[PDB]
Design a protein around this ligand. Sequence first.
Ligand SMILES: NC(=O)c1ccc[n+]([C@@H]2O[C@H](COP(=O)([O-])OP(=O)(O)OC[C@H]3O[C@@H](n4cnc5c(N)ncnc54)[C@H](OP(=O)(O)O)[C@@H]3O)[C@@H](O)[C@H]2O)c1
Ligand SMILES: NC(=O)c1ccc[n+]([C@@H]2O[C@H](COP(=O)([O-])OP(=O)(O)OC[C@H]3O[C@@H](n4cnc5c(N)ncnc54)[C@H](OP(=O)(O)O)[C@@H]3O)[C@@H](O)[C@H]2O)c1
Lengths: 246, 246
Amino acid sequence: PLRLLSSVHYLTDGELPQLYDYPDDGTWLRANFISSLDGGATVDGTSGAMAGPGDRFVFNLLRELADVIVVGVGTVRIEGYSGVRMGVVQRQHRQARGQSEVPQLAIVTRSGRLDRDMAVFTRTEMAPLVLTTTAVADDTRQRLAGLAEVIACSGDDPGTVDEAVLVSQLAARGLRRILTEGGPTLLGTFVERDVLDELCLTIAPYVVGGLARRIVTGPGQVLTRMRCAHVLTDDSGYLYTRYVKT
Amino acid sequence: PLRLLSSVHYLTDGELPQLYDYPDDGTWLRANFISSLDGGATVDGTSGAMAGPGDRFVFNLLRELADVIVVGVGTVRIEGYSGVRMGVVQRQHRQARGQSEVPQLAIVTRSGRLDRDMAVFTRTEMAPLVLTTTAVADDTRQRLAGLAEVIACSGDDPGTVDEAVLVSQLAARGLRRILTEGGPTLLGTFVERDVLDELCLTIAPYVVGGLARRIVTGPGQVLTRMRCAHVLTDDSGYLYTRYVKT
Ligand SMILES: NC(=O)c1ccc[n+]([C@@H]2O[C@H](COP(=O)([O-])OP(=O)(O)OC[C@H]3O[C@@H](n4cnc5c(N)ncnc54)[C@H](OP(=O)(O)O)[C@@H]3O)[C@@H](O)[C@H]2O)c1
Ligand SMILES: NC(=O)c1ccc[n+]([C@@H]2O[C@H](COP(=O)([O-])OP(=O)(O)OC[C@H]3O[C@@H](n4cnc5c(N)ncnc54)[C@H](OP(=O)(O)O)[C@@H]3O)[C@@H](O)[C@H]2O)c1
């Protein structure tokens, strides 16, 4: 029944993208998170502490592959989101694949209460998308004129975001290779709404104790089976897993 | 940097214990938990739903190997703990290793408010240990006379349990191969107190959303590095990991 996993293959620069390729067509919502062994998403309020040697490799790759990075407004402020920096070689590979040189950032907010003075609009090569509700879209649009394209992502209720709508709105703009890196609330809603296609999860070899929240938070409770596509490791005992929805 | 993990070896009946052996001497506190990809310890309030094909294999093995199973009084009630059932072959292998035929159960409680009428004392081959505080030990001892050996596990504060003391009290009684299966509060305190030597964690290939709590709960925040001793898998995409403290 049980099989021992072992390192059978060293990954170099180029086999790595293959492992994390998006499907050749269709919208694909990929999440990339890190957590402790005991499910803590945070250490001292952020994720960067737990980050593996591999983790920044993988984190960067997934960004390189994404058409858009979708992020909750909470993570933007907390993780200090600025523009998606692509290095010269990253830009090259993106252009080679026919994508823009830098992935778009898309910020999800139900409230739309994004300060014009927010950090996220400032140090960036590209104006973010703001994914919000039909209700607040117009005001948000005017308030953020010149700083962000504001997109209504309501489905039926104009006062909330419909996550499948959100996904289709991004697809609608050719941003079908979607990466989300947080936060837990956002991820929680993707999970609740069953629109998460893939979870790339770094499991950091730490226990952090009970204080930390999980990589998903919120009222959602589901039981979505996923298929383990791969587990990578490094010498530091990290697991870089990639699971795709059944 | 990254290595692809793959199934290199089929585990049979007998190589499995080797992977999960306790050190030949010394006290060893091993936890065995299961969680979802997104760190949920529970589904609908229990853990059994997520359980792999492998998971009951491993769960049983770890029990077979343990001198004592330490459990919070919460898990006892919630998971419906009765006596540790060992099958005839399990008993045999335990005797072969010089252990009692059935592992002892040890219930941790600060309050000591264990009903004499509790389920845990009833359907069992062996009287449980009750690990509690110096303060309530005497009353708990009298109240549970005939049903459980009550052991004070205070260190300095007689009103709380000192987890290192708890471990030594079990060692003191020859129960040095310790398995805990919960709950999160208990595990949280083992983690807080840095007495957890090993975490065997089943990662079930599900996301469950934000409602679930983690396999550790409580106020504790630590950053304890662990070494990945092994990752096993099955066809169902479960990971049966074993991490030992650095
Ligand atoms: N371990 C990891 O991998 C990881 C990764 C990322 C973040 N984190 C951590 O998690 C924490 C942040 O948590 P968080 O839950 O507040 O982050 P968040 O999900 O990014 O932010 C929450 C806010 O974003 C908006 N939002 C999220 N989902 C939405 C939805 N479905 N529809 C409309 N708006 C939505 C809402 O904004 P409005 O209030 O404006 O409506 C919501 O209040 C930080 O500590 C961060 O470091 C950890
Ligand atoms: N996914 C998994 O692998 C897994 C495994 C096990 C359990 N669970 C789940 O977790 C839930 C139970 O959570 P829980 O935190 O209440 O379980 P718990 O830790 O077993 O029970 C908590 C209680 O046990 C006692 N306790 C725990 N740690 C103690 C300590 N260091 N010192 C003194 N007493 C201590 C206290 O009893 P007193 O109040 O009497 O002082 C405490 O209130 C259930 O839903 C269960 O299914 C999940």
